[PDB]
């Protein structure tokens, strides 16, 4: 996500701003607000008079979230098998706003790393599946050769 530009100089340096653009404003002492409230998943052992307040704007919100280390460790219900009374704890490490999304939550759960890898192996199959009609010719050969097929499934 970087426009290729040249070295700046006394000559003029045009860069197609594929972007469009906004504007800004300023004041006296800004209307400063203090958002107070539970922002992590525990209770910190330091007393209140020693911990600090961090200043957040739109540019540094990704750095305030990363240095907080919001580590959410909880035991949730296991719905990956036929057991209703099974539980499965998780381990979460959040560094960006996209870590709330299920692409990065399931990537941090090792029981779901093998299921996305299962799906990525199935999306890879669908492309060359219906293009070559000789695949079903050897599905019947794997229907015939049952001994050599099961020896290769364990590999």
């Amino acid at each position: 996500s970087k426009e290729g530009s040249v070295a700046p100089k006394e000559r003029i340096n045009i860069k197609y701003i594929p972007a469009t653009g906004d504007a800004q404003a300023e004041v006296e002492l800004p209307l400063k607000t203090l958002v107070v409230g539970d922002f992590k998943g525990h209770a910190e052992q330091t007393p209140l008079e020693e911990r600090a307040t961090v200043t957040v704007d739109k540019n540094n919100f990704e750095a305030v979230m990363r240095e907080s280390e919001l580590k959410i460790t909880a035991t949730v219900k296991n719905k990956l098998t036929d057991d209703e009374n099974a539980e499965l704890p998780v381990e979460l490490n959040f560094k960006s706003l996209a870590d709330f999304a299920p692409d990065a939550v399931a990537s941090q759960v090792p029981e779901l790393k093998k299921l996305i890898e299962l799906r990525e192996a199935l999306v890879a199959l669908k492309g060359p599946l219906g293009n070559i009609p000789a695949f079903r010719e050897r599905l019947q050969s794997l229907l015939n050769s049952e001994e050599s097929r099961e020896k290769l499934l364990a590999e």
């Binding site: 800004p30 409230g37 922002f39 890879a124 079903r136």
Partner: protein, 473 residues
């Protein structure tokens, strides 16, 4: 080595160059699930791969509706993504900053139990002394409380110690009451309440009706129901990368990421400041109290196609007026769209009934203007500017006549003593008249009891419209 023969016959990735270890995992995974239904045809297998993806997504999304939607996760997602709704809306280029303090709600009352006086607390260090009570430091406009208040003693002792903190640093503490505050234990039965005035005159609320009568309660607003933060995902509307995620939201409306409206009410404190550099403009559906761009979730009802309400109840106009008299900043939702509105930002203080004299009927209307809280925010700024402006002056060569002049020529750029100025002069200059009477202190000469007496403009609230027909005129 027949699996190597299928890769070498596959001419797209045959001679072991790139992607031959991934596609080898693709063939061997499909054969292990093929024994449930034996079939030999590639285009049916192109559906049988998809029939092994729909049953796979029933295994994954039922787990990702359980790794999400947890009381540790969702309460720590709404408290943090709701901050992003407060960061994205407020224009930080237009002189705005926001501090972020990690407390917990049970720690904070202990921290007021920690110090013998509120003027030595640990929250007093971060609200007053690190900000406002500091040479050159930027002062604190308001305190967003990301809390869920009960009417119990550990939450009326906190607000008694937050009204006294708000009266020292001149900053109102905005937070929200919970469902259990009204005594309903589940929130969507709020319009079913047929008399909310009699609910507040219950002996459970003796520490509430004594909080309201108190003097320092002027710096305490308690906000709206709640509001929605995250639209549940969808493989067509809001997809995710390399996955199809349909977030199955059940009949329990607690699984929606419901935020805290102290975020959303302070959005209007700051989006009023980014436009006019003041803040009385917080109570208008077309005048700066309109929380726009709410998340909506169009789902299928019992036959019809409706939308999930972004605030959890539809506050009627009579219910909101009854909350306005009882000291609440309610958020009515524009039924059928993604907008909402505040109508009255009244703090929890009660207008004290004064006796029917000439001054008593006058001072009742005078004391009524204190409680309403857009008017505190045009004099909290007249406690933050004037603290800073008369801090630089210490050590100068001044007089009482010079003290009268450095204030009168200062505040008369905020005063537009005019019956009908334009709509920009009213909000850039929110005051209307200001009296400054500088006196002395005898005994120790050179100590100045001045009395800045500002006066605001008056907004639009209620009329009668008593229709009839005349027939001729």
């Amino acid at each position: 080595g027949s699996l190597l023969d299928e890769i070498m016959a596959q001419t797209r990735c045959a001679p072991s160059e790139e992607g031959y270890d991934i596609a080898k995992k693709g063939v061997a995974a499909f054969i292990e699930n093929l024994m449930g239904s034996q079939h030999s045809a590639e285009p049916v297998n192109k559906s049988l791969v998809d029939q092994m993806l729909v049953e796979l997504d029933k295994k994954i999304s039922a787990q990702m509706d359980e790794i999400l939607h947890n009381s540790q996760f969702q309460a720590m997602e709404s408290a943090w993504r709701g901050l992003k709704l407060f960061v994205d809306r407020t224009d930080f280029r237009e002189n705005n900053k926001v501090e972020i303090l990690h407390v917990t709600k049970d720690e904070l009352l202990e921290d007021f139990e920690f110090a013998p006086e509120t003027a030595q607390s640990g929250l007093y260090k971060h609200v007053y002394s690190a900000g406002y009570g500091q040479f050159g430091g930027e002062p604190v406009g308001a305190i967003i409380g990301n809390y869920a208040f009960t009417p119990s003693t550990p939450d009326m002792k906190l607000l008694q110690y937050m009204g006294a903190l708000g009266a020292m640093a001149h900053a109102p503490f905005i937070s929200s009451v919970g469902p259990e505050f009204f005594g309903i234990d589940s929130f969507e039965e709020l319009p079913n309440i047929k008399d909310l005035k009699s609910t507040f005159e219950s002996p459970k609320y003796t520490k509430w009706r004594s909080l309201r009568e108190s003097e320092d309660a002027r710096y305490l607003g308690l906000t709206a129901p709640r509001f929605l933060l995250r639209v549940p995902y969808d493989p067509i509307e809001n997809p995710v990368k390399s996955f199809n995620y349909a977030e199955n939201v059940s009949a329990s409306h607690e699984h929606y990421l419901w935020g805290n409206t102290a975020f959303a009410f302070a959005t209007r404190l700051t989006d009023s400041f980014a436009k006019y550099r003041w803040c009385p403009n917080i109570i208008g559906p077309q005048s700066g109290g309109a929380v726009e761009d709410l998340p909506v979730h169009v789902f299928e009802s019992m036959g019809a196609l409706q939308s999930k309400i972004p605030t959890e109840v539809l506050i009627t106009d009579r219910k909101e007026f009854e909350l306005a008299e009882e000291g609440f900043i309610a958020l009515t939702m524009r039924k059928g769209s993604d907008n909402a509105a505040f109508f009255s930002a009244n703090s929890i203080q009660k207008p004290k009934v004064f006796p029917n004299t000439k001054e008593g009927k006058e001072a009742e209307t005078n004391y009524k203007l204190g409680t309403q809280l857009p008017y505190m925010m045009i004099i909290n700024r007249l406690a933050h500017y004037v603290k800073v402006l008369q801090r630089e002056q210490i050590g100068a060569w001044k007089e009482r006549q010079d003290l009268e002049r450095e204030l009168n020529s200062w505040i008369k750029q905020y005063v537009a003593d005019q019956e009908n100025p334009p709509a920009d002069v009213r909000s850039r200059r929110p005051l209307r008249a200001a009296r400054i009477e500088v006196m002395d202190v005898e005994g120790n000469p050179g100590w100045y009891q001045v009395s800045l007496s500002v006066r605001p403009h008056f907004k639009y609230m209620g009329a009668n419209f008593e229709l009839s027909l005349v027939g001729r005129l």
